[PDB]
Amino acid sequence: TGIGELAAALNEFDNKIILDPMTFSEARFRPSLEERLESIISGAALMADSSCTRDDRRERIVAECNAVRQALQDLLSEYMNNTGRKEKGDPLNIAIDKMTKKTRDLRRQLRKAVMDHISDSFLETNVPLLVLIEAAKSGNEKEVKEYAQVFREHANKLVEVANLACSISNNEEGVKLVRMAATQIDSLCPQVINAALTLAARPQSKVAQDNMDVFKDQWEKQVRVLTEAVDDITSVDDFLSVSENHILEDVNKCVIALQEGDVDTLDRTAGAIRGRAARVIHIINAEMENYEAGVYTEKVLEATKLLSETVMPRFAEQVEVAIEALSAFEENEFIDASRLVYDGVRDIRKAVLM
């Protein structure tokens, strides 16, 4: 029950700005209208200051917050004229359209800022567990304690992002489906920690081991449920555009790493590029299930398979060449392959948006 709090606030605000021109007074409406909008702006600002929001995006959100605020001022001015007449006159009408457009624009950047998080956060979603299990398999209860904390933080970050996606969603069932999933991640987290702790206490115990395995398997499952639910309330539009932005950022980083002969950074960053690619194909395959087979799904799936079958492996191989040469030359091959990954993602997006 309920949609996202921020979504609902924005939706109400769009309704509440529509007033009988005749019975209007600033004294009566200004305070609540102003308050609603500022409350929206606090939410948008939190979002904008949040860890994964890119700089450009924080800037655009900030610019949209100043623009709605000034749009309401403009609207209220126009209501103040136009007072004591029956019909909304022209300056008031266009002012209402303006208020509503800017509120749409704000929504868009918020959706985009939420993708920044989704893009980053739902990569290599397993690593922390794997690390925490390796430590447990070693005995060191000091070390298992700290990696357990790292696992908790990652657990919460996932739930944090789920929540962010909820609060801008207008899909009541979708939102419900993610909150449940996030709940399961909450109860499941400490239990996974226990199994790890009990295991590290007695690393030779076959029970402790089987028990870790049962929690490993459950957790990985439930993360996939949370991932999918979040995917399900996220527009593939925003997913594509943000994945394109991030891939281009990652490419720049690789290029730098290459300039610096830096294999660690190159390897970690090219990994993200592959993850992000895998995640578009994931989300887009899933989206195509909402369409009957035909011309539209055909073009999309041919573009998804080409990226999958040909272009990615050709990118991974090229990375290996570089890492081999730097570990022991022409960068053209790495540039060309990165461009083809990006471009492959553009073709998917073109086909989806047909």
Curated annotation (Swiss-Prot):
Expression across tissues is: Expressed almost exclusively in the nervous system.
In terms of domain of life, where is this protein from?
Eukaryota
Phenotype upon knockout?
Mice generally die within 24 hours after birth. They display altered Purkinje cells migration, unstable synaptic junctions, defective ventricular architecture, impaired axon migration, reduced number of neurons in specific nuclei, and disordered laminar formation.
- Where is the protein localized? Cell membrane; Cytoplasm; Cytoplasm, Cytoskeleton; Cell junction, Adherens junction
Subunit note = Interacts with CDH1 and CDH2. Interacts with ZNF639; recruits CTNNA2 to the nucleus. Interacts with F-actin.
Function, as annotated = May function as a linker between cadherin adhesion receptors and the cytoskeleton to regulate cell-cell adhesion and differentiation in the nervous system. Required for proper regulation of cortical neuronal migration and neurite growth. It acts as a negative regulator of Arp2/3 complex activity and Arp2/3-mediated actin polymerization. It thereby suppresses excessive actin branching which would impair neurite growth and stability. Regulates morphological plasticity of synapses and cerebellar and hippocampal lamination during development. Functions in the control of startle modulation.
Q: Which family is it part of?
A: Belongs to the vinculin/alpha-catenin family.
Other comment = The cdf (cerebellar deficient folia) mice are viable but are ataxic and have cerebellar hypoplasia associated with abnormal lobulation of the cerebellum. They also display defects in Purkinje cells positioning and in packing density and lamination. Fear conditioning and prepulse inhibition of the startle response are altered in cdf mice. Those phenotypes are associated with alteration of the Ctnna2 gene which results in the C-terminal truncation of the protein and are rescued by expression of a Ctnna2 transgene (isoform 2).
Name assigned to this protein = Catenin alpha-2
Tell me which species this is from.
Mus musculus
- Give the residues of the full protein shown: 271 to 629 of 953
